[PDB]
Structure 1
Amino acid sequence: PFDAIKQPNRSEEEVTQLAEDFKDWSKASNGWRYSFITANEKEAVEDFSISGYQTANDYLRATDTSTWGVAGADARQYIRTVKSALNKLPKYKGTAYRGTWVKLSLLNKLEEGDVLVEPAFTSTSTLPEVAKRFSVVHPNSPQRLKRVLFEVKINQGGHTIAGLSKEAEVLFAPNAHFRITQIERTSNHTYIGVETVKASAVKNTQKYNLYSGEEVE
C-alpha cells in the first residue's frame, strides 16, 4: 500500500522527462471541446499554477470576503473562467498525488468510506515527487496540523492542465469529493488513499470539509 509514495524520489532528469511526456500526451489528447476554449480561458489556466490559485483558493475558503472589494469580483470571474476552461480540457483518469496539512482533530475521526470535500480547487500531480514538495513546511496554526499525503484514484472530475502550463498537473473544480479507501497512520506519517466520487452519489456516510474539519450536511 502506498508503495509509490514510500519509495525514493526519482532523479530530476527522470522527473523532468516524465513531466514532458505528460505535457505531450495532454496536448495530443485535446478533443472537439478544446476548439471552443477562449483566449481568456487559456490565459487564466496558464496563470493558475503560478499565482492564480493562491487568491482563488483563499476566496473559496474564506468565511467572509467583505474586505475584498473589486478583488472579490475579479476572483469570482477568475474562478468561473478556470472552471469553464477545465471542462474543455482533456480528462485524466488513473492515479495522482497531493500533499496537504490537515487538522489532527479531523484526522482522528477519519475512517474508510468517509468523504472528504475540498472547498478550494484541488491540484494533484501524477508524480509523487511533486506532491511531496508542496507539503514540507509547517503553517502557523493554533490547532495541531499533520502532513498528509494522498494517493488519489481519479475516475472522474480531473482534467490535465499540463498542455497549457507544477509538473504533470491534474486539476479539479472546487468542492470535489473524495471517498477514503485506505488509511495508513504510523508515528512518522499519514497516508490516505481516496477515490473521486460524485457528490450526488454520496449516501449514508459522513462528509467532512478537508480544510475546516467541519462535518458537511
Structure 2
Amino acid sequence: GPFDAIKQPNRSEEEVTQLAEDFKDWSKASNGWRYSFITANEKEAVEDFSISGYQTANDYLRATDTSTWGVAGADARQYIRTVKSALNKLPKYKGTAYRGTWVKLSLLNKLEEGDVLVEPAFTSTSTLPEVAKRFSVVHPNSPQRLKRVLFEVKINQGGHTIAGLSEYSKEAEVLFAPNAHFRITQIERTSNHTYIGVETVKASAVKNTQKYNLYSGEEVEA
C-alpha cells in the first residue's frame, strides 16, 4: 500500500502527543559538541520559528524582489542567518518524515520520477504524518489551481531536528535550510490528492535531470 502511512486514519491524540514528546526528548539527548556553541539569539529564533518566525522568513525567501521589503528586509536577513547558524548546531535526523503543502497543478502535471524539487524557503517536515496533514487543509487565495500534496520524505542529509528547542509547539519537526533539493522517487495521483515520495539530494550532485522550483513552478537551470 504505497503512501498508506499518510492515507490511513490518524493515530490517537495520546499516541501522537507521546511520540512528539519522545522525539523532543530524543532531540535534546542527541545534542552534540556543536550545541555547546549555540547562542541566546539562536535559541530565541528557533523557539519561535514554528509559530510565527517561519511566516516572515519564508516570505522573504520566496519574494520576487527583496529590495521592496525596506527595513523589514534587514531584519528578515538577520533572522534567516540566525536560524541557519542554529540548525548546523542541532542534531541531524535521518529516516522518514512528512510534509503537507499545496502545489500548482501546472507543476504537478509535469512531474516524473527522477525530477528534483527545489524549495526556496525553509523546508519544515514532521516525523508524524498526522502533523503534516494539518498543513494540507486550507490555502490562501490563488488564481492558479493548487492541489493538496503530501510528501513522504526520505532524509539522508540536510535535516535537523528543532523539536528539542520548540518548547511551545509539539510537531516533531525536522527543518531544512533554504534551497533544499528533493529527488522524486514515486508519485501517486488519486481521488484529487497527490502523494509524492522524495529523497534528499545534494544540489551539486544533481546531474542530467530537470529541477523545478516547488513554489513558483519554474524550471531551475542545471
TM-score for both structures, normalised by structure 2: 0.96
Q: Report 1:1-217 matches (<5 A).
A: 1-164=2-165, 166-217=170-221
C-alpha contact (below 8 Å) 1:59/1:65 kept by paired residues: yes
2:186 partner SS: strand
| Deviation digits for residues 67-111 of structure 1 (CA, Å, limit 9, x no counterpart) | 322110000000000000000000000000001110000000000
C-alpha contact (below 8 Å) 1:180/1:194 kept by paired residues: yes
How many equivalent residue pairs? 217
Q: State the alpha-carbon separation in 2 of the partners of residues 106 and 67 from structure 1.
A: 27
How far did 1:3 drift? Answer: 1.8
How far did 1:47 drift? Answer: 1.3
1:97 partner SS: strand
C-alpha contact (below 8 Å) 1:118/1:174 kept by paired residues: yes
C-alpha contact (below 8 Å) 1:96/1:128 kept by paired residues: yes
Q: State the alpha-carbon separation in 2 of the partners of residues 34 and 73 from structure 1.
A: 26
C-alpha contact (below 8 Å) 1:49/1:166 kept by paired residues: no
Distance change (3 Å), C-alpha of 1:141 and 1:166: farther
Distance change (3 Å), C-alpha of 1:49 and 1:138: closer
How far did 1:187 drift? Answer: 3.2
C-alpha contact (below 8 Å) 2:21/2:170 kept by paired residues: no
How far did 1:138 drift? Answer: 3.4
How far did 1:166 drift? Answer: 4.6
Q: State the alpha-carbon separation in 2 of the partners of residues 119 and 179 from structure 1.
A: 15
Identity %: 100
Q: State the alpha-carbon separation in 2 of the partners of residues 70 and 54 from structure 1.
A: 17
C-alpha contact (below 8 Å) 2:17/2:170 kept by paired residues: no
How far did 1:186 drift? Answer: 1.6
How far did 1:135 drift? Answer: 1.4
| Deviation digits for residues 174-209 of structure 1 (CA, Å, limit 9, x no counterpart) | 000000000001233110000000000000000000
| Deviation digits for residues 107-146 of structure 1 (CA, Å, limit 9, x no counterpart) | 0000000000000000000000000001101331111110
Of 202-211 and 44-53, more deviation after overlay is shown by 44-53
Of 159-168 and 87-96, more deviation after overlay is shown by 159-168
| Deviation digits for residues 137-164 of structure 1 (CA, Å, limit 9, x no counterpart) | 1331111110000000000000000000
C-alpha contact (below 8 Å) 1:97/1:152 kept by paired residues: yes
2:187 partner SS: strand
In structure 1, runs of 5+ residues without a counterpart are none
1:132 partner SS: helix
Q: State the alpha-carbon separation in 2 of the partners of residues 54 and 97 from structure 1.
A: 19
In structure 2, runs of 5+ residues without a counterpart are none
C-alpha contact (below 8 Å) 1:117/1:177 kept by paired residues: yes
Q: State the alpha-carbon separation in 1 of the partners of residues 148 and 7 from structure 2.
A: 14
Q: State the alpha-carbon separation in 2 of the partners of residues 50 and 102 from structure 1.
A: 22
1:134 partner SS: helix
C-alpha contact (below 8 Å) 1:130/1:166 kept by paired residues: no
Of 132-141 and 202-211, more deviation after overlay is shown by 132-141
Structure 1 runs, 4 residues or longer, greater than 2 Å off: none
TM-score for both structures, normalised by structure 1: 0.98
Of 192-201 and 158-167, more deviation after overlay is shown by 158-167
2:67 partner SS: coil
Q: State the alpha-carbon separation in 2 of the partners of residues 138 and 163 from structure 1.
A: 29
